[PDB]
Amino acid sequence: MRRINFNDNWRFQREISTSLREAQKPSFNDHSWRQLSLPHDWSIELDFNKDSLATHEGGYLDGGVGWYRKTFTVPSAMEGKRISLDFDGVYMNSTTYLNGEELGTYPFGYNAFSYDITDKLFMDGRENVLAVKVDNTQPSSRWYSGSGIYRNVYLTVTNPVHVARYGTFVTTPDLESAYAARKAEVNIKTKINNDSDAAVQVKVKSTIYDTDGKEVASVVSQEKTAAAGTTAHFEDNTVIENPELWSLDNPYRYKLVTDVLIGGETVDTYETRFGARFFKFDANEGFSLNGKPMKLYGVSMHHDLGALGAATNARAVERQLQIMKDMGVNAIRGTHNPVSPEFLEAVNNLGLLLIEEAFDCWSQSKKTYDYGRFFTRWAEHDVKEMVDRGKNEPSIIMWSIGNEIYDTTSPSGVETARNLVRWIKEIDTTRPTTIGEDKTRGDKVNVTPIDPNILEIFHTVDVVGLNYSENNYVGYHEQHPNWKLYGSETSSATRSRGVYTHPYEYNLGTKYDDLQQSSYDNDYVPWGRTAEDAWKSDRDLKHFAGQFIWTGFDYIGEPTPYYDSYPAKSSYFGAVDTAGFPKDIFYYYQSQWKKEPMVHLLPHWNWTEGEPVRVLAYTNAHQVELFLNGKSLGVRGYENKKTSWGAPYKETKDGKTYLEWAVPFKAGTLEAVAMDENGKEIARDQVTTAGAPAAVKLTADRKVIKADGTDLSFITAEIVDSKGNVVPNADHLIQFHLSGHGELAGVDNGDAASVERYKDNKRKAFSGKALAIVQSNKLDGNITLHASAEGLSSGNVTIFTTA
């Protein structure tokens, strides 16, 4: 096979009391070391440490130095092949050794890297020893990084003449024109390395298949010389008749098969999935995909997967992006680093647009051990790795050169911004460059005079991302009519799932004794906005392409506004908690961004008789009538408004994008009946007063999963009363017992202020719920999860795994 899974049969040990510098030596004694499979994050397995050098920013989880070793033989089927060791990502500052000799060192923690080991392996079934030193000396990060070989590891095995790494570039030049003529013009550039010791003549055959595997196009290149140790470049054009475009609703991808021909014989075969799509950022009209105008309904996403830490998992990342798509999201910003290949696969298959972002710093460091100290020597390598990895991916629309980069106020920053966009364009000229810039925010009210160096950087990129800068959206468009503006980072409102504090108080960067934030859209950072305010500023302007809220999902670390407030260890920014459980604001975004009628009530209905409860309805319906125990508490409605260019939206006469009642509490059932303009019912939602806690209820998101050792079932554990109603403030400890053909990969409840382990077999409910993550093994069979709590009845669920 051309690519081999190399994740199995590793050994791992943290450096704690004594130096592991000798672990580079083949003869080093690792018989005491832990045996594991990658991917692996060593930080997520550790207890929280309030004295951690990671601090609150890194979620109080230690990093430090760790070593991996693998002892292996080479199969005889690999003799005379080119062999490379491919890491998708190691966090961070790794040094790799084979048979006691350094292959190299790799500072950056979020790019793939590769070492040719063809001439370094012992063949003849002799033992080889790989040793990887991982140096995550802290503090290295403003968010939870994780530590170790947290992404997949592979061998690439080819004949001496082969398609290079990232050796194809498939494009659809002038697709808008071609498509109106019922075709896609397909430009294919192919790089062939000759790693033999003598020149060859080589041709490239390019065959395009549809998703059913039907051939749709074919082209054979002219012959070209490839001298020994050099790359030959080919460029070929073909046509797909009546092409299927890649779009959000139909994320259709073709497959290019590249055959490398020498003397008519195939010496290499290489596959490239791609999509045909075109898009535009317009200074006046905003964004459009395949000629359809739309706003970017965007979220920022960090790379951790909650209770899995950084350790990549295709199903976990697909689940996060499915939940974002359910919220009405059409676009993601990879804040603030290249994403995993599993994340790319998910956005390509789900139909989501992606901004890929290289850097959280250039040379000026944000944290002592971050990439800043490497930047001046490695930035060209790392930015080109990101672009070269992702240039064929239809989901990727833009390349961000950085986020909130201090250097952009300096002439040094101007020169760096020119270098980064030049280096990107040497790989890919088909996508706009961008940056996320916060330093024009100024006083949040008036149009900020732009720093001269920021202004020259805004002229250097194709598309200007503003962070937290609503006051400039109109002014910069008027003063710079050719700029394409969007919100690269917005809101940073803070909220805890199921917490309904200070209901009539709108507070900025305020801490409470409960270590929580309120889900009335009424807690947000001093630089930020409510969800509503950041949305209104965008909604109202056609020229503004859209926005990427901070954030879609909670992540580990950055527990703002609880800066020094252990056990506050994970974020409040997410629309959805680390466990995948939506907060109320998830339904606010649905109400603004989706067409399918919905209505969502908050808060819960467990209060004290007589107390006036602030009741909200998030809804895209014209009106809602609220009922308590079957009796009307009154109709609330929107005006059917239009933006300046006639786009319809719903807002009250007082400017609200939600509906509101004040209800004297009476136990029972509160019901929201959503109606169209005519009074016809189009959606309903209810909340019931819960009784005493009685049982643990388990629900699997997927009852059947693959017995491949990596597929997951996400099990919701709820605390319910004797009628099955979720107890909305329940915090009961749930003990999980797993039996069968699987393992408990993690537990979570999304509570930012919990220092319960993620790697454990018990978890407290938070606001009624907890999560258990069940992983398959390689033998098919049944997995049974039993969940108990003191004084309650137990819950049980069976998962089937298929081989």
Q: Give contact residues for Cl ion (rule: CB under 5 A).
A: 274-275, 394
- Give min distance, CB of 253 to Cl ion, in A: 7
The string of DSSP letters for 692-750 reads: S--EEEEEES-SEEESSSS-EEEEEEEEE-TTS-B-TT---EEEEEEEESEEEEEEE--
Closer CB to Cl ion, residue 245 or residue 720?
245
- Give min distance, CB of 281 to Cl ion, in A: 18
Residue 327, amino acid:
M
Q: Are 390 and 400 in contact (CB under 8 A)?
A: no
Closer CB to Cl ion, residue 254 or residue 535?
254
Catalytic residue among 57, 385, 393, 404: 404
- Provide the greatest CA pair distance for the chain: 89
Strand residues in 365-518 grouped as ranges (E): 396-403, 433-437, 463-467, 485-491, 507-508
Angstrom distance (rounded) from CA 286 to CA 528: 23
Angstrom distance (rounded) from CA 388 to CA 169: 9
What length does the chain have? 803
Catalytic residue among 393, 489, 625, 718: 489
Q: Which residues contact 354 (CB under 8 A, 6 or more apart)?
A: 331, 332, 333, 334, 339, 344, 347, 393, 395, 396, 397
Tokens of 520: 């009335």
- Give min distance, CB of 111 to Cl ion, in A: 20
Query: Is there a catalytic annotation at residue 380?
Result: no
Q: Rounded to the nearest 5°, which phi and psi values hold at 745?
A: -80, -20
CA atoms within 13 A on the CB side of 38: 25
Q: Are 38 and 85 in contact (CB under 8 A)?
A: no
Angstrom distance (rounded) from CA 456 to CA 597: 45
- Give min distance, CB of 391 to Cl ion, in A: 8
- Give min distance, CB of 393 to Cl ion, in A: 6
Cα angle 338-344-350, degrees, rounded to a multiple of 5: 140
How is the chain split among helix, strand and coil, in percent rounded to 5? 15, 40, 45
Q: Rounded to the nearest 5°, which phi and psi values hold at 536?
A: -55, -45
Task: Please list every residue in the chain followed by a chain break, i.e. its C lies more than 2.5 Å from the next written N.
Answer: none
- Give min distance, CB of 326 to Cl ion, in A: 25
Closer CB to Cl ion, residue 253 or residue 763?
253
Closer CB to Cl ion, residue 431 or residue 583?
431
- Give min distance, CB of 396 to Cl ion, in A: 8
Closer CB to Cl ion, residue 148 or residue 394?
394
Closer CB to Cl ion, residue 275 or residue 465?
275
Query: Is there a catalytic annotation at residue 756?
Result: no
Closer CB to Cl ion, residue 251 or residue 582?
251
Q: Are 675 and 683 in contact (CB under 8 A)?
A: no
- Give min distance, CB of 180 to Cl ion, in A: 20
Q: Which residues are the active-site residues?
A: 404, 489
